[PDB]
Design a protein around this motif. Structure first.
Motif, mmCIF file in Angstrom:
data_model
loop_
_atom_site.group_PDB
_atom_site.id
_atom_site.type_symbol
_atom_site.label_atom_id
_atom_site.label_comp_id
_atom_site.label_asym_id
_atom_site.label_seq_id
_atom_site.Cartn_x
_atom_site.Cartn_y
_atom_site.Cartn_z
ATOM 1 N N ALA A 35 29.284 -11.881 8.207
ATOM 2 C CA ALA A 35 29.456 -11.197 9.483
ATOM 3 C C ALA A 35 30.369 -11.986 10.413
ATOM 4 O O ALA A 35 31.140 -11.400 11.181
ATOM 5 C CB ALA A 35 28.098 -10.959 10.135
ATOM 6 N N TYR A 36 30.284 -13.318 10.372
ATOM 7 C CA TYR A 36 31.226 -14.141 11.123
ATOM 8 C C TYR A 36 32.653 -13.894 10.652
ATOM 9 O O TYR A 36 33.576 -13.788 11.466
ATOM 10 C CB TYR A 36 30.856 -15.619 10.985
ATOM 11 C CG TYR A 36 31.699 -16.570 11.807
ATOM 12 C CD1 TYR A 36 32.384 -16.134 12.932
ATOM 13 C CD2 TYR A 36 31.815 -17.905 11.451
ATOM 14 C CE1 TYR A 36 33.157 -16.998 13.680
ATOM 15 C CE2 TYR A 36 32.586 -18.779 12.193
ATOM 16 C CZ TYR A 36 33.254 -18.320 13.306
ATOM 17 O OH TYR A 36 34.022 -19.187 14.049
ATOM 18 N N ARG A 37 32.848 -13.788 9.336
ATOM 19 C CA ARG A 37 34.165 -13.441 8.811
ATOM 20 C C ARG A 37 34.627 -12.088 9.330
ATOM 21 O O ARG A 37 35.794 -11.920 9.704
ATOM 22 C CB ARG A 37 34.148 -13.441 7.284
ATOM 23 C CG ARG A 37 33.825 -14.778 6.660
ATOM 24 C CD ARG A 37 34.933 -15.764 6.953
ATOM 25 N NE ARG A 37 36.185 -15.350 6.332
ATOM 26 C CZ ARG A 37 37.379 -15.821 6.665
ATOM 27 N NH1 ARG A 37 37.521 -16.730 7.616
ATOM 28 N NH2 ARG A 37 38.456 -15.367 6.031
ATOM 29 N N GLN A 38 33.725 -11.105 9.351
ATOM 30 C CA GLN A 38 34.091 -9.774 9.828
ATOM 31 C C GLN A 38 34.489 -9.804 11.298
ATOM 32 O O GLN A 38 35.470 -9.166 11.696
ATOM 33 C CB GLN A 38 32.939 -8.798 9.602
ATOM 34 C CG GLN A 38 32.525 -8.646 8.150
ATOM 35 C CD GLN A 38 33.481 -7.790 7.355
ATOM 36 O OE1 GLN A 38 34.592 -8.211 7.038
ATOM 37 N NE2 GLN A 38 33.054 -6.577 7.025
ATOM 38 N N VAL A 39 33.740 -10.543 12.120
ATOM 39 C CA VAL A 39 34.099 -10.691 13.529
ATOM 40 C C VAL A 39 35.449 -11.383 13.660
ATOM 41 O O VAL A 39 36.251 -11.054 14.542
ATOM 42 C CB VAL A 39 32.997 -11.456 14.286
ATOM 43 C CG1 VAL A 39 33.413 -11.705 15.726
ATOM 44 C CG2 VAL A 39 31.701 -10.686 14.246
ATOM 45 N N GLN A 40 35.723 -12.349 12.780
ATOM 46 C CA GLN A 40 37.015 -13.026 12.795
ATOM 47 C C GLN A 40 38.159 -12.055 12.541
ATOM 48 O O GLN A 40 39.246 -12.216 13.105
ATOM 49 C CB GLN A 40 37.030 -14.146 11.756
ATOM 50 C CG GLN A 40 36.483 -15.466 12.257
ATOM 51 C CD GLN A 40 36.619 -16.575 11.233
ATOM 52 O OE1 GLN A 40 36.861 -16.319 10.055
ATOM 53 N NE2 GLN A 40 36.465 -17.815 11.680
ATOM 54 N N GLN A 41 37.936 -11.043 11.703
ATOM 55 C CA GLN A 41 38.933 -10.023 11.417
ATOM 56 C C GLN A 41 38.918 -8.886 12.432
ATOM 57 O O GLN A 41 39.380 -7.783 12.119
ATOM 58 C CB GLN A 41 38.731 -9.471 10.006
ATOM 59 C CG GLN A 41 38.618 -10.537 8.938
ATOM 60 C CD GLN A 41 38.814 -9.983 7.546
ATOM 61 O OE1 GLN A 41 37.901 -10.008 6.721
ATOM 62 N NE2 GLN A 41 40.010 -9.478 7.273
ATOM 63 N N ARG A 42 38.385 -9.132 13.631
ATOM 64 C CA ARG A 42 38.358 -8.152 14.719
ATOM 65 C C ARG A 42 37.581 -6.896 14.339
ATOM 66 O O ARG A 42 37.893 -5.797 14.803
ATOM 67 C CB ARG A 42 39.773 -7.787 15.177
ATOM 68 N N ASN A 43 36.567 -7.044 13.492
ATOM 69 C CA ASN A 43 35.698 -5.936 13.121
ATOM 70 C C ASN A 43 34.405 -6.032 13.921
ATOM 71 O O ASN A 43 33.694 -7.039 13.842
ATOM 72 C CB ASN A 43 35.409 -5.954 11.621
ATOM 73 C CG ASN A 43 34.700 -4.704 11.149
ATOM 74 O OD1 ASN A 43 34.636 -3.706 11.864
ATOM 75 N ND2 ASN A 43 34.162 -4.752 9.938
ATOM 76 N N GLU A 44 34.105 -4.985 14.694
ATOM 77 C CA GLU A 44 32.890 -4.990 15.500
ATOM 78 C C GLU A 44 31.636 -4.890 14.646
ATOM 79 O O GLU A 44 30.563 -5.329 15.074
ATOM 80 C CB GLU A 44 32.910 -3.842 16.497
ATOM 81 C CG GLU A 44 32.901 -2.491 15.831
ATOM 82 C CD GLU A 44 32.926 -1.372 16.829
ATOM 83 O OE1 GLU A 44 32.934 -1.670 18.040
ATOM 84 O OE2 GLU A 44 32.959 -0.200 16.405
ATOM 85 N N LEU A 45 31.740 -4.302 13.453
ATOM 86 C CA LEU A 45 30.568 -4.179 12.595
ATOM 87 C C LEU A 45 30.002 -5.545 12.244
ATOM 88 O O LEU A 45 28.802 -5.669 11.973
ATOM 89 C CB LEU A 45 30.921 -3.402 11.329
ATOM 90 C CG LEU A 45 29.741 -2.928 10.480
ATOM 91 C CD1 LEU A 45 29.065 -1.740 11.134
ATOM 92 C CD2 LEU A 45 30.198 -2.583 9.074
ATOM 93 N N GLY A 46 30.841 -6.580 12.263
ATOM 94 C CA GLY A 46 30.345 -7.924 12.049
ATOM 95 C C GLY A 46 29.462 -8.420 13.173
ATOM 96 O O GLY A 46 28.630 -9.301 12.965
ATOM 97 N N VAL A 47 29.630 -7.873 14.379
ATOM 98 C CA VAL A 47 28.783 -8.280 15.498
ATOM 99 C C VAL A 47 27.350 -7.804 15.286
ATOM 100 O O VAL A 47 26.393 -8.574 15.437
ATOM 101 C CB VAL A 47 29.358 -7.759 16.827
ATOM 102 C CG1 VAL A 47 28.491 -8.205 17.989
ATOM 103 C CG2 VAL A 47 30.784 -8.239 17.008
ATOM 104 N N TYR A 48 27.179 -6.529 14.932
ATOM 105 C CA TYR A 48 25.837 -5.997 14.717
ATOM 106 C C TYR A 48 25.179 -6.626 13.499
ATOM 107 O O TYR A 48 23.985 -6.944 13.528
ATOM 108 C CB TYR A 48 25.891 -4.479 14.573
ATOM 109 C CG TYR A 48 26.554 -3.779 15.730
ATOM 110 C CD1 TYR A 48 26.042 -3.881 17.014
ATOM 111 C CD2 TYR A 48 27.693 -3.018 15.541
ATOM 112 C CE1 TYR A 48 26.647 -3.241 18.073
ATOM 113 C CE2 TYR A 48 28.301 -2.377 16.590
ATOM 114 C CZ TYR A 48 27.777 -2.489 17.854
ATOM 115 O OH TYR A 48 28.389 -1.846 18.902
ATOM 116 N N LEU A 49 25.937 -6.811 12.417
ATOM 117 C CA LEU A 49 25.400 -7.492 11.245
ATOM 118 C C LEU A 49 25.038 -8.935 11.567
ATOM 119 O O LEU A 49 24.024 -9.449 11.085
ATOM 120 C CB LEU A 49 26.405 -7.431 10.096
ATOM 121 C CG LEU A 49 26.779 -6.035 9.598
ATOM 122 C CD1 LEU A 49 27.998 -6.095 8.696
ATOM 123 C CD2 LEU A 49 25.614 -5.393 8.876
#
Length: 297
Positions: A35-49
């Motif tokens: 999820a940290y990786r997803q947030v790094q890629q500007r993906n908001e779904l990583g925030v909720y995960l």
């Protein structure tokens, strides 16, 4: 003044919690990194995960004390104080996790069913704001046990932590809120959002039939795991609240379903094991990220 003889309240909850700790801690840490990786890629779904993983990690952290409490046949001796904090975490992270699962479902519904729209609601900043609001609301809404007595010793040897037999009126209304607003409402939103996602996917032409079937199976699996994990405990909770409001002084039902109640409470802990699997380790991208992180480690 009520019994409890959950003769299997010292075998199933502790063993299940041990398995939950042992499997969840690595899987939840890996899911948090993904999820940290997803947030790094500007993906908001990583925030909720990421927030879901944080809540699951706190649940697993508070779990071993509940394992010791259950191994002593419902005797918690740490203190008046750890009872309150750790029981609050234990009984609240279920609803924090379900709220964030509903947030994930609604975000996916907005992304898939309504693309080209609601770009403002699909940013990392709004994801963080929604997460903060969810955390504050859940802690505030579940703050009633913090302001009352948290530890009760019955006439018998065992001393409870956040539970009491017979139960109280305030905790009865609290349980009604938890069943109907804490669990049933977010689950209904998840069901509606995933139904909308499935309708939108069936309305698409780029994805083949196999991919549509896979998406439908994944969505039904998410809904079914949430319901199976959280349904027995909430049904028994609603039943206990109903009979307590109906006749308080007839605890023949508290003694009748005491073992099933604690077994369902223990079974609800499997959601923090299913979440890293169902949201990180089933799809290829997150598993590949976790893989890069482990080989580099």
């Amino acid at each position: 003044g009520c019994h409890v003889d959950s003769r299997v309240d010292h075998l199933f909850p502790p063993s299940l919690y041990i398995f939950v700790i042992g499997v969840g801690l690595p899987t939840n840490c890996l899911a948090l990194w993904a999820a940290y990786r997803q947030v790094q890629q500007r993906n908001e779904l990583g925030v909720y995960l990421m927030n879901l993983s944080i809540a699951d990690l706190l649940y697993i952290c508070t779990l071993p004390l509940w394992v010791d409490y259950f191994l002593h046949h419902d005797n918690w001796i740490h203190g008046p104080g750890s009872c309150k904090l750790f029981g609050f975490i234990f009984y609240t992270n279920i609803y924090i996790s379900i709220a964030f699962l509903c947030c994930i479902s609604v975000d996916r519904y907005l992304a898939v069913a309504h693309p080209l729209r609601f770009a403002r609601l699909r940013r990392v900043k709004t994801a963080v704001a929604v997460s903060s609001v969810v955390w504050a609301t859940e802690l505030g809404a579940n703050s009633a046990p913090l302001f009352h007595d948290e530890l009760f010793r019955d006439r018998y040897n065992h001393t409870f932590c956040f539970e009491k037999f017979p139960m109280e009126g305030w905790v009865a209304w609290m349980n009604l809120y938890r069943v109907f607003v804490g669990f049933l409402f977010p689950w209904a939103l998840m069901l509606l959002s995933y139904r909308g996602i499935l309708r939108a996917v069936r309305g698409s032409v780029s994805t083949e039939r196999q991919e549509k079937a896979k998406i439908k199976r994944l969505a039904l699996s998410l809904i079914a795991i949430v319901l199976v994990c959280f349904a027995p405990y909430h049904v028994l909770l609603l039943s206990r609240s109903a009979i307590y409001l109906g006749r308080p002084w007839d605890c023949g039902f508290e003694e009748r379903v005491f073992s099933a109640y604690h077994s369902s409470l223990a079974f609800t802990s499997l959601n923090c094991v299913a979440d890293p699997i169902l949201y990180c380790l089933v799809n290829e991208g997150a598993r590949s990220d976790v893989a890069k992180a482990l080989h580099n480690l």
